[PDB]
Amino acid sequence: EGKLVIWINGDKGYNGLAEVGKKFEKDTGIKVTVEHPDKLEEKFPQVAATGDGPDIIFWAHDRFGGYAQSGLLAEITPAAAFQDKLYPFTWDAVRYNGKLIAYPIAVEALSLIYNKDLLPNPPKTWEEIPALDKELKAKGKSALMFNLQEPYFTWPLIAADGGYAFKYAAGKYDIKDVGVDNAGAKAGLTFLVDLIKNKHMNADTDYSIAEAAFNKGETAMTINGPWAWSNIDTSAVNYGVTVLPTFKGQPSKPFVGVLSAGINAASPNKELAKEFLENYLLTDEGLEAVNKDKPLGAVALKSYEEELAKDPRIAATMENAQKGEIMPNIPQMSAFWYAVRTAVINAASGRQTVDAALAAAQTNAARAAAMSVALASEYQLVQNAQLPQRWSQSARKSLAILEATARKEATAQMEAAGGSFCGQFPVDPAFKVLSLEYSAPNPDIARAIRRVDSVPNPPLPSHVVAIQSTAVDADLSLAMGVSLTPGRHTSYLVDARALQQSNSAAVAARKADGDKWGPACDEMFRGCRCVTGQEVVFYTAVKEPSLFKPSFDGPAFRPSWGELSGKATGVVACVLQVPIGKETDIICAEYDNLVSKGQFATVTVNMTGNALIQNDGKAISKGYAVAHRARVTSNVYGKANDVSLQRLAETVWSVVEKRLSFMPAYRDLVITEQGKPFMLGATATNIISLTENQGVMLHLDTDDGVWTIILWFHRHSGIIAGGEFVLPSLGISFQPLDFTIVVFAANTIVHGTRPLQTTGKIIRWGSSHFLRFKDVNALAQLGAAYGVDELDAKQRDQLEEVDAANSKDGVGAARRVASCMAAERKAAIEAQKAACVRGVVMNPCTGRMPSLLFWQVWRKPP
Numbered sequence: 001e002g003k004l005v006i007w008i009n010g011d012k013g014y015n016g017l018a019e020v021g022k023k024f025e026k027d028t029g030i031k032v033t034v035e036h037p038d039k040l041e042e043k044f045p046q047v048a049a050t051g052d053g054p055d056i057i058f059w060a061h062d063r064f065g066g067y068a069q070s071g072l073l074a075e076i077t078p079a080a081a082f083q084d085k086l087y088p089f090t091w092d093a094v095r096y097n098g099k100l101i102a103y104p105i106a107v108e109a110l111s112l113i114y115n116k117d118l119l120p121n122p123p124k125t126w127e128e129i130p131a132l133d134k135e136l137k138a139k140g141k142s143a144l145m146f147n148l149q150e151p152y153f154t155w156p157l158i159a160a161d162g163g164y165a166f167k168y169a170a171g172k173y174d175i176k177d178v179g180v181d182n183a184g185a186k187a188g189l190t191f192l193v194d195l196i197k198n199k200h201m202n203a204d205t206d207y208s209i210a211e212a213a214f215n216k217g218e219t220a221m222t223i224n225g226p227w228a229w230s231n232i233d234t235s236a237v238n239y240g241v242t243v244l245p246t247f248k249g250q251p252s253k254p255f256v257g258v259l260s261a262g263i264n265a266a267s268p269n270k271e272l273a274k275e276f277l278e279n280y281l282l283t284d285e286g287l288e289a290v291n292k293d294k295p296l297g298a299v300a301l302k303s304y305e306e307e308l309a310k311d312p313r314i315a316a317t318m319e320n321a322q323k324g325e326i327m328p329n330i331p332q333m334s335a336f337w338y339a340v341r342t343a344v345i346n347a348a349s350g351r352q353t354v355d356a357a358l359a360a361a362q363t364n365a366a367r368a369a370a371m372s373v374a375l376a377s378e379y380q381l382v383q384n385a386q387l388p389q390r391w392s393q394s395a396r397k398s399l400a401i402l403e404a405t406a407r408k409e410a411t412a413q414m415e416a417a418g419g420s421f422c423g424q425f426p427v428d429p430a431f432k433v434l435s436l437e438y439s440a441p442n443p444d445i446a447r448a449i450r451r452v453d454s455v456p457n458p459p460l461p462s463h464v465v466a467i468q469s470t471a472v473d474a475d476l477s478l479a480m481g482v483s484l485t486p487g488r489h490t491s492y493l494v495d496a497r498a499l500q501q502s503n504s505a506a507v508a509a510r511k512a513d514g515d516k517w518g519p520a521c522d523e524m525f526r527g528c529r530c531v532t533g534q535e536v537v538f539y540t541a542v543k544e545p546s547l548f549k550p551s552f553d554g555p556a557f558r559p560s561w562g563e564l565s566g567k568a569t570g571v572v573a574c575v576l577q578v579p580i581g582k583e584t585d586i587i588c589a590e591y592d593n594l595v596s597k598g599q600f601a602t603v604t605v606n607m608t609g610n611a612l613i614q615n616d617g618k619a620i621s622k623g624y625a626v627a628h629r630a631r632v633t634s635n636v637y638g639k640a641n642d643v644s645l646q647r648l649a650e651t652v653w654s655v656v657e658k659r660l661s662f663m664p665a666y667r668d669l670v671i672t673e674q675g676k677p678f679m680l681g682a683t684a685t686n687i688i689s690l691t692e693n694q695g696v697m698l699h700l701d702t703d704d705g706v707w708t709i710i711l712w713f714h715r716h717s718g719i720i721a722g723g724e725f726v727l728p729s730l731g732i733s734f735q736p737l738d739f740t741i742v743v744f745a746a747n748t749i750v751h752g753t754r755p756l757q758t759t760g761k762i763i764r765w766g767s768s769h770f771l772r773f774k775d776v777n778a779l780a781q782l783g784a785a786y787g788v789d790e791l792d793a794k795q796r797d798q799l800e801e802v803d804a805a806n807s808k809d810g811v812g813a814a815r816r817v818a819s820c821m822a823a824e825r826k827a828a829i830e831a832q833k834a835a836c837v838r839g840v841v842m843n844p845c846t847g848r849m850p851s852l853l854f855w856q857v858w859r860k861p862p
């Protein structure tokens with residue numbers, strides 16, 4: 001690769017780091033690029049999981065231990081002589097499982113910040129503050145205001161006398177040993193609430209109130225970090241930054257954040273990143289260059305820290321950090337934070353006793369941390385799950401004979417008819433269908449009748465191979481749960497490495513075109529082979545050692561094709577041609593019913609199904625707002641549209657499942673008991689889209705299920721030019737005919753639809769049946785909080801109450817009522833979410849569903 005890509009947050013001094021990068025290009029001739037991507041917390045583990053991303057990542061050490069569990073970070077091997085150049089505790093912050101996993105850069109912690117004019121000598125102890133507030137109240141001021149809403153800010157006091165998140169021992173944090181409940185933590189929080197009850201502090205004080213008050217000279221003290229200094233620097237306040245007050249003679253223990261630089265485990269530039277960080281960045285001039293852009297605060301490098309500590313504010317930061325506790329670098333901190341946030345809010349407001357608040361927090365944090373471990377175990381079993389065994393040597397031989405017989409029938413039939421047909425559409429793979437004509441001779445669906453424009457059909461790209469052998473066909477059919485029309489289908493093998501490369505190229509082309517079908521996407525398209533009118537399946541083959549995660553410890557089958565040995569196969573795409581009939585009648589009828597009854601909501605794209613639109617404050621049950629209203633306002637049958645949606649989802653599913661037996665297996669694996677009532681019928685669909693003569697840019701979906709179904713049907717007669725569905729990383733494209741369905745892995749296969757031009761009245765209706773997991777999780781959560789069957793009654797009540805406010809007092813009053821409901825809903829969702837209530841099985845590393853399922857390992861030993 002011979003280059004270095006670095007990700008750092010936008011709030012840091014990246015241009016200063018970019019200057020350090022130049023000086024690196026000088027000596028080694030290696031370019032250093034420094035990007036600052038938004039949502040960086042979540043972006044790195046999602047991209048690094050696939051062997052992609054930067055060489056170097058810059059973030060707080062706390063996240064890095066989770067990354068280390070996922071093997072996304074390289075073990076750094078610094079010499080004992082380099083390790084001396086940094087404070088030993090900062091090295092402790094970047095240790096996971098005996099191993100060093102990142103380079104410490106900067107050190108941050110809360111300090112006491114005080115107004116020098118109101119308070120020349122800040123108190124040494126918390127115990128003095130009540131007396132000090134009494135004095136300052138007489139002058140119309142207050143002693144102390146800081147954020148009471150987030151436990152980060154209140155924890156220093158709580159930790160002082162004892163009290164910790166998880167007990168650290170032998171290089172590990174004990175998940176089962178939470179320190180929320182001890183006498184130490186109890187005393188700390190007691191003192192905090194005593195300050196509130198004795199009117200020294202207000203329970204509603206948040207970050208903004210505290211910052212405003214201190215920066216305007218209204219309060220003598222606040223508690224904040226180095227990020228807050230810039231704002232105070234613009235104000236009239238003469239301020240100092242000092243050691244946090246002691247409690248019962250012990251130091252307040254703020255959490256310590258260590259900004260760190262980790263090396264990507266999938267980076268080919270490991271020894272040159274080691275070079276860059278050790279010799280160019282972790283030096284006085286190195287950190288100086290960064291410091292001059294945006295200040296680092298305290299730093300891990302002893303020599304430069306001695307310089308910075310000349311600023312008393314930096315000195316105070318380090319001192320508080322050393323008296324503090326390194327923030328645990330494990331994901332189970334989320335459990336700690338939610339439970340402690342609830343406890344502090346409750347104890348401060350009087351909703352619970354300090355003793356009651358901490359007792360519940362201890363119990364809940366331990367429970368939630370235990371469950372999250374259990375969920376990670378189960379996810380591994382999900383990723384590694386195998387289809388029910390249908391494959392055997394005798395079964396594949398049997399199936400190959402059947403398939404061979406069917407190929408002869410299909411040939412004889414083709415001979416008799418003068419060629420191949422999909423419905424009435426003449427199918428010739430020598431040609432690419434660039435435009436085509438549909439006729440509508442009756443009120444049924446318009447039918448593809450004639451190829452209009454064509455070019456000679458481009459060959460398959462080199463990484464995609466049509467499978468010739470019936471034995472191999474039967475091998476894959478039986479192992480992958482795919483049963484296409486006998487003698488009338490093609491199977492393909494796609495090289496997994498090249499598939500991922502082509503995905504990247506496709507995304508690049510769309511970006512270059514400016515998020516649109518332009519020249520670069522067109523050039524890719526010109527290389528895609530037409531499979532219009534075909535029934536096809538694409539298997540990807542992963543070589544045993546990536547985007548794909550097969551378990552090579554899984555059971556192996558013996559392939560008839562030796563080229564499959566040492567490889568795992570998964571189904572990435574399947575194109576079906578549904579014969580016009582009862583099922584297509586039912587499906588198209590439901591679309592018409594849902595369109596007529598105003599049940600498609602506009603987001604463009606029209607949508608329906610079991611959504612939960614959280615932007616709608618009053619939404620508390622499954623569906624779009626139109627669905628909620630119809631359940632109430634209907635004078636015939638409240639459930640009518642839900643019967644329609646279930647039949648729609650179930651009929652499409654049934655058609656797909658006849659051909660793809662892995663689909664119900666996927667449904668059963670990833671939909672939880674709590675998610676089932678919020679899926680549309682017995683399917684893996686919760687949302688259904690609808691498009692009218694529309695293209696869509698090439699893209700990967702992110703927050704959808706493992707497989708997505710798309711179908712098309714046509715309404716009037718006419719000619720359509722363009723509008724191909726394109727799978728550029730598979731090197732194929734097609735025109736939808738009478739009733740074409742594609743089932744494909746939408747999170748891992750790039751896809752889109754070219755713009756259309758039409759002649760006549762022809763409408764091509766496109767529709768995706770998919771799993772949008774955010775809706776099913778939130779709904780499963782609401783179901784756990786209120787009861788699945790209570791949601792309709794809540795929705796009816798919430799609609800009535802919002803209507804009343806509008807009818808009585810205006811739009812403003814009603815939207816305030818909706819705003820109230822939204823907060824209450826939020827709190828309920830949040831509480832269930834903390835209890836690990838889920839609608840679907842998800843990757844704890846990525847927060848997404850697995851990239852594929854049901855991998856089959858093939859091995860042919862001699």
Ligand SMILES: O=C1O[C@H]([C@@H](O)CO)C(O)=C1O
Nearest residue numbers: 689691696752753766767768
């Ligand atoms: O290429 C696409 O076309 C369909 C659209 O017709 C239905 O939404 C969709 O899901 C895309 O990603």
Ligand SMILES: [Fe+3]
Nearest residue numbers: 699700701746
């Ligand atoms: Fe899509």
